[PDB]
Amino acid sequence: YVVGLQWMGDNYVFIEGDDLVFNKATTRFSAADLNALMPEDAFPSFRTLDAGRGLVVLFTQGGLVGFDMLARKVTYLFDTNEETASLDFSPVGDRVAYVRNHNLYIARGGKLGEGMSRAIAVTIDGTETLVYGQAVHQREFGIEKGTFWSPKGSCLAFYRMDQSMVKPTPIVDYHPLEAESKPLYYPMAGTPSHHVTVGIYHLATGKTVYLQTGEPKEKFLTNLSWSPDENILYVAEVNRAQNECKVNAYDAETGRFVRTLFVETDKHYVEPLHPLTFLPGSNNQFIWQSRRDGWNHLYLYDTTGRLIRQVTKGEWEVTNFAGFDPKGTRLYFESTEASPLERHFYCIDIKGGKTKDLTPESGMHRTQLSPDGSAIIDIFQSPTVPRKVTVTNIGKGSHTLLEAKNAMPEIRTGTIMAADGQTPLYYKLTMPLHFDPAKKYPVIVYVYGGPHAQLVTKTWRSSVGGWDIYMAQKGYAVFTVDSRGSANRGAAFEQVIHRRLGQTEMADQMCGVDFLKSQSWVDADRIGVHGWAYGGFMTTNLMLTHGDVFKVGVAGGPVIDWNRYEIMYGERYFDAPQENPEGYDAANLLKRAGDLKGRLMLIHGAIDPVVVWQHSLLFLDACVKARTYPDYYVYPSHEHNVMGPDRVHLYETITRYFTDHL
Template identity: 50%
Template structure:
């Protein structure tokens, strides 16, 4: 009897282990918005922030102090609940950060408001409820005022409930305190406090000359129109000004940026002494940049410090960074030598030196050490598939690599520059956080993410490279193979594509960046293939701007190099190739189906650009110029005049309230297809914008999968 029980127990354990190893995932477990998504998503529960040279660890609702010299020693500091009980609004604290170096003030925020907590006295010294219907809230650096917007105007309050209107625009076509230029050029907001909190710069955007674009809201009993301002390529664009409000006097002046008004005002930053505002100004053609300085008191133009031009485009995305302890110098990021690098200037506009150079790109600038002698940054050196931390000495120009473990690193540096915290993952590493003592070259792991797929037989993700259509440029790809892959079989292929600027899908991060839908398709018996073509980012200007004035041409050629590679593999069924992508990837999906109509069996295109003349001014004109300047390029890249070439099964998906790629794109393609006698399928997600979120995102991927299963099997 005992032997039988042991045998039965072993049988049950073996069956459970086998079931675990051969688990089939649901989309609810693989797609954001799914009810079990976070059960299989690598997570690191702790967050780390520097307080001078002390490391603070946030875990759940508690904060601990970590000794950098002995990271295993952690001391409890306080719980968020202490703030919650003392805060006026009583909201759940969702984020905390130290307001500035050398301060014990902790800035906290919740859904209801924000404030400041003094660690020494354990008292809330400022608590400000977010005013009803407010947005874009920004606390002043001195923790006295809260700036925010309501509808199209800008306000401040001092926490006593007193509200001061900085602008009073009655025309809803004039918007203050919000991001402008459709968030291009690195713009993330429209409120810019001065370093001491004495003045507030802000964007004022006049959209009255931009055509109102109708978006229909079907949620009401009778559908209503909610118009947006959408400047299309070659048409009238909005005009932007920068105001400066003096908190003490209550007066506002506007920077005298002059004519033409139809230009881009970007990368706004204050000088450390609050006397000047620096603005990177770009012409409408986006090929001539001026770094201009203005007097913050009068708004008068002071000086053009330097200029940059390029025959295709200049794209500033980062403001000048003033050198710590030396406000007479700043660092500027530029692609002027073909790669994004760092340049040291003085405030007269004189170039002192190029700090970094080489066939690699700086991707992030972290900050300076305590003395302002070294600048920390992240770059694509030594491989564009990874990100590593470096420091550069501003005087000697010597560069030192600070992270050596393979992967994609994001870093935070202590006040003195002695310690570095690196959060990173790699293809075989779901996530780790290390603390690095740069003085003693000592690295200690603070925490690690568990492998959510441990013990499960997973689809295998492989990395490779092939030559681009130019015959010389290396392109990187990943391929996902079913867990039970058999090279003697023939497999259908799902190609996932994006292919546009500001993207890189293949990286040495967890599972090479492979997402949940790829896993889902692999377990259904597909090979999944993802390739970064020329035109994508982090490989230099020549790699990216080869697509200028003819978007979709070179990208499709490179993707077809990937297709030819796939067809050369004995286990690929060349008769069952499908492609899917969203936004630019939706454009690429249809583009590939129409340029190479005999190749693909199925395509699913989400939120696709169909004709670049229907896309917005800033992005569209950067990469295509205007339709008036480049009529041949617009004609050759338009998918409307190619609708008759459709031979594959094609599903187009669009959100009916999409403000990015308006649904006119898809509807125009349907109209052209009707005229040409072709038959794409169409599916709409009511109430959604440019992509589907929440539970509907799971439905979206089920719908995409069903289409592949119906027509690519």
């Protein structure tokens, strides 16, 4: 990454230590010039709010400074009471919503000099048991926050989560003299889910209204989408069985149910991940993403509920919807049409038809469509190309903004059949530094395998934070393969795992082993395995299932008993435990601890809210009574992943463990 590249109206900006170089399709702006315009070394970090209007917000000791870049003027001063995590600025740019001590507030931006005004408390009965304005449903179904402003800043929609009926998991903080425990309302598979409702605060009247979403109370309220009109608030409702998704229209004034536009079901599960996105200047048509036909595509609906058409279609998937052209006759997006291993920015006619790849060079393309929808910033990188920024006037020439190119582990890539004998799996093989084919090196299988992830793509070097490359330097070869269940290969490719977590995944992973055994340089007796989270589940499951093949493994934050995983994610792929005993039992690693004959180290972050510590601890417990002997390590200060400098320590631990036992 090189100094935050992005759009500012019709200018594409990027920093330069002390400078913020604005350019087009050219003029600087120093941290100094900026300070000159402030009230009270390099260029300060900031969050862009309105790329188009160039409005941004600067974080500074005491309040936030709204600042306009295209007009170099300080917009407003906001006082959030030192709360930044939940900051959600009104689209009008003059107000910001945030959560503080369980409640939702709206601080009004104060003009420079004109004085500040007391923030407004939208709610006042918030609690650790009653959460307001924050992510809900375990951050599934695209939910990343809990506040939603109406297009015109007239209303502020927000979640209200009653989790008082959820038996909590303790999260211990071991730093105080005496350790302190805070409860974590983590709803486990099969247990009563939390109860969510959507409230709507009207800035004008200060009046609040909750959508009459009805019963059952556990209904999953996802993807809130306001109407450009602000009269309707759309909600993508999903049932507990997660096999039905009703998109409903709600009266934002009264909260009354208006009607169901459309419903979509699926044999295994439906999983809405994006809001409705209306066409520019339209209040009757909107684009909706669906994976209904086995591939995520863009559909053009009409607020009546009538499907006008499926804009994109094919055995590939849209991996990001960037938007439209000013008129709204073309849709821009990122997809795997070129290859499951690549990402290209496209552009298709709103009427459908052929798509035009705008970033055809083989590799990974991460593109940013400009505001005026004309130009395009493109950051590319392939196995051969480290990076290559390319601002482009859609139509004109493609002025390159930056190009680069660089003993190291040889990385090989190939394909192999999955355990079904027909499905093509992709793998990346990191050869040991100073590889000598005369030799017989030890190999470690790095594995995730779970849904929503794809590890093998045409990128630059590693795609696992460089752990593979680290290990390769210590003499071990690392191998990864996106087994069935992995992402971006279509619904059929993924859903095969339904109700049978771990089964096909391992069957496919063993095909990755056969491949490795086919290499002369592969020492079939020194095969290891490593993984985190879902990869932890796999690493352990593999060692207990194929104790003869894998000698050593290290499993971080491993899911051991899926009955203890969250309702939302867990139930989608496994279904409730009461309705699928055999599936759950086959994956309950606690039941097969006695099969641990090799050397395995579980690693966990004590205050982990994703995969509760209990998982790895209970495994150890099962081992004590089954008389098996795993190893262990705990990071008391970390949650799910060890981030920051501590990661040097994590890598050192994981690595040394293999150099010690593999």
